[PDB]
Amino acid sequence: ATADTSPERLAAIAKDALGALNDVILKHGVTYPEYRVFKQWLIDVGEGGEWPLFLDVFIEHSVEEVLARSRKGTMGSIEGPYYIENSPELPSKCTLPMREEDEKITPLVFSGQVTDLDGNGLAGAKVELWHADNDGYYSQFAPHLPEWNLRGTIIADEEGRYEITTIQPAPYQIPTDGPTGQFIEAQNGHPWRPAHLHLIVSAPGKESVTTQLYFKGGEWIDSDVASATKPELILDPKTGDDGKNYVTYNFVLDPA
């Protein structure tokens, strides 16, 4: 990972960040024993390989909020720690890879079109989708799952249209066996995210958008531990006579 940040810019960010932390220490009268606990906890975060998790939960939403000021298209949201690049390509009408266990879940059929800011359909568009299964596990982050379970790269049609069948995601508990869970426990918080799909949508000459879609009335939608839920991203699927939930959501991309 590399960035184009000048020493002047880093100096000013660092001064603000450390002054802020130091101001919090002074405000609350943080004590030596608390300092010692905080030191050991930072150590434990690294030892438990929890930096991507902790930062994506507690910090990433503010970085997307920065990016969100520059964009007029579909609302973005955090990537979170579970994206995997180069998931297998699928045709514009498709079903995500899933297990026999996954076929017992109520289907979700997600339709729409990738467009530009004027509403024009984009050819060449791709929709990379990934999400957790009904047990709350992500493929490649749980030894029991096929590596592409509920992951795919959907190639949209000449109009940018897609129709994707998957399973209805359910709420995700963040890992709590570790330092991040310990942090949440210590302050009587809760370690839940609402049910969600993740997507990255792209197209020739377009700025990709990384976003998430949630479900109206879903639990935790108003208290997402990751502060990543936006009202614009809440879907309201309708159940068909076949018992499947149908929903249409279009993506609007800013130009690159």
Ligand X SMILES: CCCCCCCCCCCCCCCCCC(=O)O[C@H](COC(=O)CCCCCCCCCCCCCCC)COP(=O)(O)OCC[N+](C)(C)C
Q: Which residues are annotated as a binding site for Fe cation?
A: 138, 172, 196, 198
Q: Which is nearer to ligand MCT, 78 or 170 (CB)?
A: 78
Nearer to ligand MCT among residue 173 and residue 244 (C-beta) = 173
Closest approach, Cβ 28 to ligand X, in A, equals 7
Three-state SS sequence of the chain: CCCCCCHHHHHHHHHHHHHHHHHHHHHHCCCHHHHHHHHHHHHHHHHCCCHHHHHHHHCHHHHHHHHHHCCCCCCCCCCCCCCCCCCCEECCEEECCCCCHHHHCCEEEEEEEEECCCCCECCCCEEEEECCCCCCCCCCCCCCCCCCCCEEEEECCCCCEEEEEEECCCCEECCCCCHHHHHHHHCCCCCEECCCEEEEEECCCECCEEEEEEECCCCCCCCCCCCCCCHHHEECCEECCCCCEEEECCEECCEC
When CB distances are held under 5 to 8 angstroms depending on the partner's kind, the choice from a second copy, ligand X, ligand MCT, none that residue 65 binds is: a second copy
> Which residues, numbered 64-83, are part of the site for Fe ion (CB under 5 A)?
80
Q: Is 183 in the site for ligand X (CB under 6 A)?
A: yes
Rounded CA separation 221/234 (Å): 9
Binding-residue pattern over the window 84 to 123 for ligand MCT, x denoting contact by CB under 6 A = ----------------------------------------
Q: Which of 151, 156, 184, 155 is nearest to 169 (CA)?
A: 151
Among 12, 19, 34, 135, binds ligand X (CB under 6 A): 34
Could you identify the residue written with the tokens 């159940």? Answer: 239
Q: Which residues bind a second copy (CB under 8 A)?
A: 1-5, 7, 9-14, 16-18, 20-40, 42-43, 45-47, 51-52, 55, 58-63, 65-67, 69, 183, 186-189
In the chain, the amino acid numbered 203 is A
Binding mask 214-233 for ligand MCT (x = CB under 6 A): ------------x-------
Identify what 182 binds: a second copy, ligand X, Fe ion, none; CB under 5 to 8 Å per kind.
Answer: ligand X
Which of residues 43, 59, 117, 256 is near ligand X by CB under 6 A?
A: 59
Residue 142 in contact with ligand X, rule: CB under 6 A: no
Give one word for 249, left, alpha or beta, with left for phi > 0 and alpha for psi -120 to 50. beta
Nearer to ligand X, 18 or 256 (CB): 18
CB of 58 to ligand MCT, least distance (A): 8
Q: Calculate the dihedral angle through the C-alpha atoms of 49, 50, 51, 57, rounding to the nearest 10 degrees.
A: 160
Which of ligand X, a second copy, Fe ion, none binds 51 (CB below 5-8 Å, type-dependent)? Answer: a second copy
For ligand X, the closer of residues 11 and 256 by Cβ is: 11
Q: What is the closest distance, in whole angstroms, from the C-beta atom of residue 123 to a second copy in the complex?
A: 27
Which residue ranges make up the site for Fe ion (CB under 5 A)? 80
